[PDB]
Design an enzyme around this catalytic site. Structure first.
Site, mmCIF file in Angstrom:
data_model
loop_
_atom_site.group_PDB
_atom_site.id
_atom_site.type_symbol
_atom_site.label_atom_id
_atom_site.label_comp_id
_atom_site.label_asym_id
_atom_site.label_seq_id
_atom_site.Cartn_x
_atom_site.Cartn_y
_atom_site.Cartn_z
ATOM 1 N N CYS A 114 0.950 -3.062 -7.567
ATOM 2 C CA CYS A 114 0.683 -1.937 -6.666
ATOM 3 C C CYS A 114 1.526 -0.707 -6.989
ATOM 4 O O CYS A 114 2.760 -0.755 -6.931
ATOM 5 C CB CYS A 114 0.930 -2.347 -5.198
ATOM 6 S SG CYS A 114 0.660 -1.026 -4.000
ATOM 7 N N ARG A 117 3.728 1.295 -3.686
ATOM 8 C CA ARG A 117 4.808 0.665 -2.918
ATOM 9 C C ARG A 117 5.915 1.565 -2.366
ATOM 10 O O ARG A 117 6.794 1.068 -1.664
ATOM 11 C CB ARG A 117 5.467 -0.463 -3.719
ATOM 12 C CG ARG A 117 4.616 -1.705 -3.909
ATOM 13 C CD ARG A 117 5.328 -2.680 -4.847
ATOM 14 N NE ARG A 117 5.103 -2.339 -6.247
ATOM 15 C CZ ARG A 117 5.746 -2.891 -7.271
ATOM 16 N NH1 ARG A 117 6.679 -3.813 -7.056
ATOM 17 N NH2 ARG A 117 5.453 -2.521 -8.516
ATOM 18 N N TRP A 286 -4.446 3.482 1.520
ATOM 19 C CA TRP A 286 -5.358 4.578 1.228
ATOM 20 C C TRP A 286 -5.612 4.708 -0.285
ATOM 21 O O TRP A 286 -4.859 4.185 -1.093
ATOM 22 C CB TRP A 286 -4.875 5.886 1.833
ATOM 23 C CG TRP A 286 -3.520 6.329 1.406
ATOM 24 C CD1 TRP A 286 -3.189 6.954 0.238
ATOM 25 C CD2 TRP A 286 -2.314 6.232 2.164
ATOM 26 N NE1 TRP A 286 -1.849 7.236 0.214
ATOM 27 C CE2 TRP A 286 -1.285 6.805 1.387
ATOM 28 C CE3 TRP A 286 -1.999 5.710 3.422
ATOM 29 C CZ2 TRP A 286 0.039 6.872 1.827
ATOM 30 C CZ3 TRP A 286 -0.686 5.775 3.859
ATOM 31 C CH2 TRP A 286 0.317 6.346 3.060
HETATM 32 C C1 HEM Z 1 -0.532 2.907 1.065
HETATM 33 C C2 HEM Z 1 -1.221 3.316 -0.013
HETATM 34 C C3 HEM Z 1 -1.558 2.370 -1.195
HETATM 35 C C4 HEM Z 1 -1.885 2.796 -2.407
HETATM 36 C C5 HEM Z 1 -1.948 4.267 -2.869
HETATM 37 C C6 HEM Z 1 -2.138 1.647 -3.247
HETATM 38 C C7 HEM Z 1 -2.481 1.713 -4.577
HETATM 39 C C8 HEM Z 1 -2.924 0.631 -5.282
HETATM 40 C C9 HEM Z 1 -3.796 0.654 -6.435
HETATM 41 C C10 HEM Z 1 -4.373 1.924 -7.091
HETATM 42 C C11 HEM Z 1 -3.972 -0.608 -6.811
HETATM 43 C C12 HEM Z 1 -4.858 -1.100 -7.963
HETATM 44 C C13 HEM Z 1 -6.134 -1.513 -7.227
HETATM 45 C C14 HEM Z 1 -7.224 -1.963 -8.161
HETATM 46 O O1 HEM Z 1 -7.251 -1.509 -9.350
HETATM 47 O O2 HEM Z 1 -8.072 -2.773 -7.683
HETATM 48 C C15 HEM Z 1 -3.241 -1.469 -5.902
HETATM 49 C C16 HEM Z 1 -3.165 -2.837 -5.953
HETATM 50 C C17 HEM Z 1 -2.545 -3.650 -5.038
HETATM 51 N N1 HEM Z 1 -1.896 -3.236 -3.866
HETATM 52 FE FE1 HEM Z 1 -1.562 -1.300 -3.291
HETATM 53 N N2 HEM Z 1 -1.964 0.496 -2.497
HETATM 54 C C18 HEM Z 1 -1.617 0.910 -1.212
HETATM 55 C C19 HEM Z 1 -1.390 0.068 -0.138
HETATM 56 C C20 HEM Z 1 -1.121 -1.278 -0.211
HETATM 57 C C21 HEM Z 1 -0.723 -2.150 0.880
HETATM 58 C C22 HEM Z 1 -0.602 -1.649 2.334
HETATM 59 C C23 HEM Z 1 -0.555 -3.387 0.370
HETATM 60 C C24 HEM Z 1 -0.122 -4.708 1.036
HETATM 61 C C25 HEM Z 1 0.518 -4.759 2.210
HETATM 62 C C26 HEM Z 1 -0.816 -3.310 -1.060
HETATM 63 C C27 HEM Z 1 -0.729 -4.327 -1.977
HETATM 64 C C28 HEM Z 1 -1.393 -4.349 -3.179
HETATM 65 C C29 HEM Z 1 -1.691 -5.554 -3.924
HETATM 66 C C30 HEM Z 1 -1.348 -7.016 -3.593
HETATM 67 C C31 HEM Z 1 -2.454 -5.092 -5.154
HETATM 68 C C32 HEM Z 1 -2.991 -6.037 -6.251
HETATM 69 C C33 HEM Z 1 -4.492 -6.150 -6.004
HETATM 70 C C34 HEM Z 1 -5.150 -7.179 -6.892
HETATM 71 O O3 HEM Z 1 -4.416 -7.985 -7.531
HETATM 72 O O4 HEM Z 1 -6.418 -7.182 -6.955
HETATM 73 N N3 HEM Z 1 -1.162 -2.025 -1.357
HETATM 74 N N4 HEM Z 1 -2.605 -0.675 -4.984
HETATM 75 C C1 LIG Z 2 -10.954 -2.501 -10.081
HETATM 76 N N1 LIG Z 2 -10.614 -3.371 -8.966
HETATM 77 C C2 LIG Z 2 -11.629 -4.164 -8.293
HETATM 78 C C3 LIG Z 2 -11.406 -4.253 -6.785
HETATM 79 N N2 LIG Z 2 -12.379 -3.363 -6.152
HETATM 80 C C4 LIG Z 2 -13.665 -3.097 -6.777
HETATM 81 C C5 LIG Z 2 -12.110 -2.775 -4.902
HETATM 82 C C6 LIG Z 2 -13.148 -2.525 -4.000
HETATM 83 N N3 LIG Z 2 -12.910 -1.961 -2.807
HETATM 84 C C7 LIG Z 2 -11.666 -1.619 -2.450
HETATM 85 C C8 LIG Z 2 -10.587 -1.839 -3.310
HETATM 86 C C9 LIG Z 2 -9.203 -1.422 -2.857
HETATM 87 C C10 LIG Z 2 -8.013 -1.835 -3.719
HETATM 88 C C11 LIG Z 2 -6.872 -1.175 -2.983
HETATM 89 C C12 LIG Z 2 -6.150 -1.866 -2.016
HETATM 90 C C13 LIG Z 2 -5.138 -1.217 -1.331
HETATM 91 C C14 LIG Z 2 -4.330 -1.956 -0.293
HETATM 92 C C15 LIG Z 2 -4.869 0.110 -1.611
HETATM 93 C C16 LIG Z 2 -5.619 0.768 -2.576
HETATM 94 N N4 LIG Z 2 -5.384 2.070 -2.868
HETATM 95 N N5 LIG Z 2 -6.600 0.116 -3.228
HETATM 96 C C17 LIG Z 2 -10.810 -2.422 -4.552
HETATM 97 CL CL LIG Z 3 0.971 7.523 -2.205
#
Ligand code: HEM
Ligand SMILES: CNCCN(C)c1cncc(CCc2cc(C)cc(N)n2)c1
Ligand SMILES: [Cl-]
Ligand code: HEM
Ligand SMILES: CNCCN(C)c1cncc(CCc2cc(C)cc(N)n2)c1
Ligand SMILES: C[C@H](O)[C@H](O)[C@H]1CNc2nc(N)[nH]c(=O)c2N1
Ligand SMILES: C[C@H](O)[C@H](O)[C@H]1CNc2nc(N)[nH]c(=O)c2N1
Ligand SMILES: [Cl-]
Ligand SMILES: [Zn+2]
Lengths: 416, 408
Positions: A114, A117, A286
């Site tokens: 992420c 964070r 977001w």
């Molecule tokens: C608050 C604004 C946040 C932003 C800008 C953000 C941004 C991102 C982005 C860009 C990714 C890559 C997503 C993808 O390519 O599918 C990601 C992944 C992730 N985020 Fe954040 N996130 C946010 C909030 C959170 C919150 C609130 C949590 C948990 C409490 C979190 C936990 C994670 C986790 C576990 C992943 C890995 C997802 C996966 O393995 O598919 N994020 N985040």
């Molecule tokens: C390329 N990743 C595949 C996951 N995917 C298609 C997807 C669809 N819908 C929503 C999300 C959101 C992933 C995410 C989660 C959180 C907590 C924050 C954030 N900025 N993005 C991901």
């Molecule tokens: Cl941010």
């Protein structure tokens, strides 16, 4: 393993020193002979035994009382003794609300993939451990969505449902994200909507969902309480904030009929705290622009709009070396940020998010002695090297509490 | 175990067996992955390494355990015994060189691996000799725009005190000058090396694109300066096919990319001077050399000429400027008939190469962090390709900069 590891930023020459890696609890998948850093994902109805659970719980409890500057206190020892008693008699234990909140904030803090964070300590935690039925889950989820959506002024939130017991009574949100668009495979092999979601959509349709069969149909929630068969609920549309995509310059861009949902909310992951397993813990934040502009819209296996945009831009699409693909990608991502900012819905561009992440990471090295980070995931899917993360060496390792992957419930569920 | 890698866009799965062959370390452990870290003999140590390399060479030519094989093993032993080292056969040198390229996990251009001109320079004894050998390399590989891959191999290490080193990190680089006013003329990355050249007698024209002289160390001696005859140095003025003002930016680059600071290891032998060269992927110049903050840093200027709104980052002015700069670079080299590949083509070819390698060889070590281009990552096929990284030998390795280790 060495006590001190150093990472370097090759643009600024800044060198940071990591000692937190020593607290690594789980396995990366790599070995000394092979690295699996770019592998996406490197057990039956099986649960933690008493003897496995004791040390994991003590580990977490110690860490908690360490954070509130009460390590070794009477309240620390009493909590140790109470937990150990609960595991002995009940084969498990219950977290205090304070500990649950700490654990959730730390699982985000520890989420190496992420880039967002910097905000980890501002997370609203909804304790839904009293939930017993799918309708109940639906209520909790609706409340999360409304709170997090905040009319566009998004707020990060997580809703935690009851922990796993014997493995035959799991709470699961079958949806991978709370808000997604449906995909429908046509007899002719074409797809309508989001091609990625055809399998889940089919499942829904089978469970009784009446598909509108459009390009942007919000999927229903498919909710599983206490190990029972999952049940369908339609999210009230007024809770689903959406943004139509338009471009500051190209008047024709709105004629593509694109839009996206405001709230990114993941619901297929498992939250582990002190050895306790929370198989349903939807969390939301977001968007970073590129998540939509690059992956959702321009992946070949997703909405795949590069071609159509390139055509409306009148680009030479015969050679690749014209970079017509790249030019259209930038414009799409400009329209996405512009459409979100215009409707006053929270969104961060990939330049701001990555700079913020570097500042965050540096603070974490300063106050915590490290910050696990997965470079492959942290660097944005466009313009990589013109963001500061590209040039930042990162160490990846797994700290607990953590968010983990888990099998898709339709592969494991025993139908009643 | 056999290991599977998946492409997430095509759902193609490949099975890796080749990784079982490796022995050298990656840097990672079960608990900590260092995949994004840039940098993570004796008679007794030498022979088993020698043995293995000979074993795989005779294995590659379908004569494993042959009479030629046996005598070779005997030969190498007696030679390591009496001289504390051994000399590779010609065929072994060429095989070792091509395989070092084949095994280079950070290289996206590896579909070309078996087409490599190998220049044996092991009879070289002086810096003048090295210069002659390097000039011939440059000229052959430049080939009037139709570039060809080449490598020149100088004598192997003996005692670490009589090393051959090309002190330049690449054969062709522009100089960088530290101004009084604190700004930097030319390429800021080479400011130090440039000053080392000046300190040794180099007379700087102090422009923005002055080709550095070669600095060459033979047999552990103090290095000596040589200027590459300009007619051997092919350069391309950069212009845009739509933005006629782009040529007014006054940019140019060199056509030959040629790494000269690496170490080539074969059968436990160390070739510390082995300049190798290919042809450019456009992003190397358009993104890294030109747009890196610590490099030529041209984004802002170009953004000005493009008349973009530069008050907030969310206008993606940086991204826009970046694409046009890379369009120009591809357009220029193409218009001047100088070999160059775009990151879409180069990445497709690499996926194809991976397929070939899994099919015939049982795997293909690859560093996702280096292979994915520095722009438009996910609209290239490699972004979605899972890759396993592991270290196979013969290989190219990093080594200390000689100016931190050399006694004058
Ligand atoms: C608050 C604004 C946040 C932003 C800008 C953000 C941004 C991102 C982005 C860009 C990714 C890559 C997503 C993808 O390519 O599918 C990601 C992944 C992730 N985020 Fe954040 N996130 C946010 C909030 C959170 C919150 C609130 C949590 C948990 C409490 C979190 C936990 C994670 C986790 C576990 C992943 C890995 C997802 C996966 O393995 O598919 N994020 N985040
Ligand atoms: C390329 N990743 C595949 C996951 N995917 C298609 C997807 C669809 N819908 C929503 C999300 C959101 C992933 C995410 C989660 C959180 C907590 C924050 C954030 N900025 N993005 C991901
Ligand atoms: Cl941010
Ligand atoms: C023929 C066309 C070639 C292309 C298109 C190509 C492409 C590339 C690119 C883009 C990089 C990354 C460079 C950087 O970012 O600094 C790279 C790295 C590398 N290449 Fe290739 N290359 C080619 C030929 C060769 C040859 C002939 C050799 C050796 C015989 C070679 C060996 C390597 C090695 C060892 C690296 C790692 C560099 C490092 O660690 O700094 N390549 N290549
Ligand atoms: C990120 N690059 C750092 C090294 N650098 C600035 C550099 C300078 N001059 C030339 C190169 C060429 C790298 C290279 C080598 C080879 C064999 C082929 C190729 N396409 N690129 C790199
Ligand atoms: C193969 C590779 O691991 C896979 O394509 C990854 C690359 N990096 C990513 N980075 C983010 N943020 N999201 C992703 O889905 C991926 N996919
Ligand atoms: C920190 C990180 O390892 C470093 O910036 C790497 C990332 N990927 C790269 N990829 C290529 N091709 N060249 C590079 O110099 C780098 N630099
Ligand atoms: Cl190529
Ligand atoms: Zn690793």
């Amino acid at each position: 393993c060495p006590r001190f590891l150093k990472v370097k930023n090759w643009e600024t020459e800044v060198v940071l020193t990591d000692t937190l890696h020593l607290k690594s609890t789980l396995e990366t998948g790599c070995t000394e002979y092979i690295c699996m850093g770019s592998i996406m994902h490197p057990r039956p109805e099986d649960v933690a035994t008493k003897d496995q659970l004791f040390p994991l719980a003590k580990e977490f409890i110690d860490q908690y009382y360490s954070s509130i500057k009460r390590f070794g206190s009477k309240a620390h020892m009493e909590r140790l003794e109470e937990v150990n008693k609960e595991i002995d008699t009940t084969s498990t234990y219950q977290l205090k609300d304070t500990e649950l909140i700490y654990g959730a904030k730390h699982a985000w803090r520890n989420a190496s993939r992420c880039v967002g964070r910097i905000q980890w300590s501002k997370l609203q935690v909804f304790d839904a451990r009293d939930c017993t039925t799918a309708h109940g889950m639906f209520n909790y989820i609706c409340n999360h969505v409304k709170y997090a959506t905040n009319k566009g002024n998004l707020r990060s939130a997580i809703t935690i449902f009851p922990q796993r017991t014997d493995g035959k009574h799991d709470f699961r949100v079958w949806n991978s994200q709370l808000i997604r668009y449906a995909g429908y495979k046509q007899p002719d092999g074409s797809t309508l909507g989001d091609p990625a979601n055809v399998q889940f959509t089919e499942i829904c349709i089978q469970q009784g969902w009446k598909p509108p069969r459009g390009r942007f149909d919000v999927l229903p929630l498919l909710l599983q309480a206490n190990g029972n068969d999952p049940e369908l609920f339609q999210i009230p549309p007024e809770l689903v904030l959406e943004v139509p995509i338009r471009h500051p310059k190209f008047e024709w861009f709105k004629d593509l009929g694109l839009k996206w949902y405001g709230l990114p909310a993941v619901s297929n992951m498992l939250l582990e705290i002190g050895g306790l397993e929370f198989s349903a813990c939807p969390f939301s934040g977001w968007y970073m622009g590129t998540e939509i502009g690059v992956r959702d819209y321009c992946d070949n296996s997703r909405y795949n709009i590069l071609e159509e945009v390139a055509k409306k831009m009148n680009l030479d699409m015969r050679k690749t070396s014209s970079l017509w693909k790249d030019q259209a990608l930038v414009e799409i991502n400009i329209a996405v940020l512009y459409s979100f900012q215009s409707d006053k819905v929270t969104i961060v561009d990939h330049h701001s998010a990555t700079e913020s992440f570097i500042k965050h990471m540096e603070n974490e090295y300063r106050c915590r002695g490290g910050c696990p980070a997965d470079w492959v995931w942290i660097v944005p899917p466009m313009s990589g090297s013109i963001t500061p993360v590209f040039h930042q060496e990162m160490l990846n390792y797994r700290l607990t509490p953590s968010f983990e992957y888990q099998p898709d419930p339709w592969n494991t569920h025993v139908w009643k």
